[PDB]
């Protein structure tokens, strides 16, 4: 047969990310002596839009503690954050929207975003528009914070990991229909080459396992095992359930 479409994405030739107009990597301030022993004040100079990102960015400038210069950071804007607002980042910062605090020094039920997985990686969770995590309980001895991830999974991470108070701005974006392929064309025009998508059932047997036949049908079970091979993982991979669920979701 022929190398199928999902196998060619790993080569990275035309499937790379379109990064010309992006404003830079959105990261928290580097964890230094000031943040783990006090706080540092930053000024939101301007809120700018990032190409290919649903959420807006915030350019916060800090003073370098060891050299006389200005250090401009690229934060992800939370709702309520405005230009000129003072942003306090550190262990002793107050509990206000836009501030950056370690999760060990926030109360239970706090809503935070741009959360570090490991302390010092500068933000890994609750990062897309309209997303947040909930601080469900603490653990002083064997210091770990239990959080509620946006997918609903419960995770245990260190209490020294930092996070931005509030919810990521730009929520409710996916609540509006695009109404046409043209608006969907410009959306993927700035992210990567993954649109439009041809169905594998309408392909040839060389191009997809679902291709071929006198009728457009898959032919075999679309549930693909986890231990399968590249070129076989087409369709539902390691699916523990299929079909439309009768009932509700959001497990308590």
């Amino acid at each position: 047969g022929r190398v199928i479409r999902n196998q060619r994405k790993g080569a990275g030739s035309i499937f790379t990310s379109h990064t010309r107009l992006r404003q830079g990597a959105a990261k928290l301030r580097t964890l230094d002596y000031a943040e783990r022993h006090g706080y540092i004040r930053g000024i939101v100079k301007q809120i700018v839009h990032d190409s290919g990102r649903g959420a807006p960015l915030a350019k916060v400038v800090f003073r370098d503690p060891y050299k006389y210069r200005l250090r401009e950071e690229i934060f992800i804007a939370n709702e309520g954050v405005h230009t000129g607002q003072f942003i306090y980042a550190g262990k002793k910062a107050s509990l206000n929207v836009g501030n950056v605090l370690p999760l060990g020094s926030v109360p239970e039920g706090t809503i935070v975003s741009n959360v570090e997985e490991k302390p010092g990686d500068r933000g890994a969770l609750a990062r897309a528009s309209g997303n947040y995590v909930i601080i469900i309980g603490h653990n002083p001895d064997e210091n770990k914070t239990r959080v509620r991830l946006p997918s609903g999974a419960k995770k245990v991470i260190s209490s020294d990991a930092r996070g931005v108070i509030g919810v990521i701005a730009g929520g409710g974006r996916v609540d509006k229909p695009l109404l046409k392929a043209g608006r969907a064309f410009h959306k993927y025009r700035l992210k990567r080459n993954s649109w439009p998508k041809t169905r594998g059932v309408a392909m040839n047997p060389v191009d997809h396992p679902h291709g071929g036949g006198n009728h457009q049908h898959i032919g075999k079970a679309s549930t693909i095992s986890r231990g399968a091979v590249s070129g076989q993982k087409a369709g539902l991979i390691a699916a523990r359930r299929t079909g439309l669920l009768r009932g509700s979701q959001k497990t308590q």
Binding site: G80, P107, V167
Partner: protein, 91 residues
């Protein structure tokens, strides 16, 4: 004189895309094109550009909000519970 009965702003789409899809877009396009009050200067000059960014016409204050509304109802109750937990620290 009122020119359309129910399509309103979505009259530019003609007869395409269905009535129900056009109806929910109408609710969000009205929100994203309307003006809002500036909490800092008190003027009705807040307008949307580059969704998630809300700029006051005068007053140069730019506030990060929702995609189609200046304040998301989810963020409204978050701003309250973040506020509520804050009085338990000092008092």
């Amino acid at each position: 004189a009122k020119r359309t009965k129910k399509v309103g702003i979505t009259g530019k789409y003609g007869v395409r895309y269905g009535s129900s899809l056009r109806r929910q877009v109408k609710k969000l396009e009205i929100q994203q094109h309307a003006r809002y009050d500036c909490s800092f200067c008190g003027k009705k000059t807040v307008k949307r550009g580059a969704a998630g960014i809300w700029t006051c016409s005068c007053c140069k204050k730019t506030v990060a909000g929702g995609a189609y509304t200046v304040s998301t109802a989810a963020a409204a109750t978050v701003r309250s519970t973040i506020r509520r937990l804050r009085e338990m620290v000092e008092a």
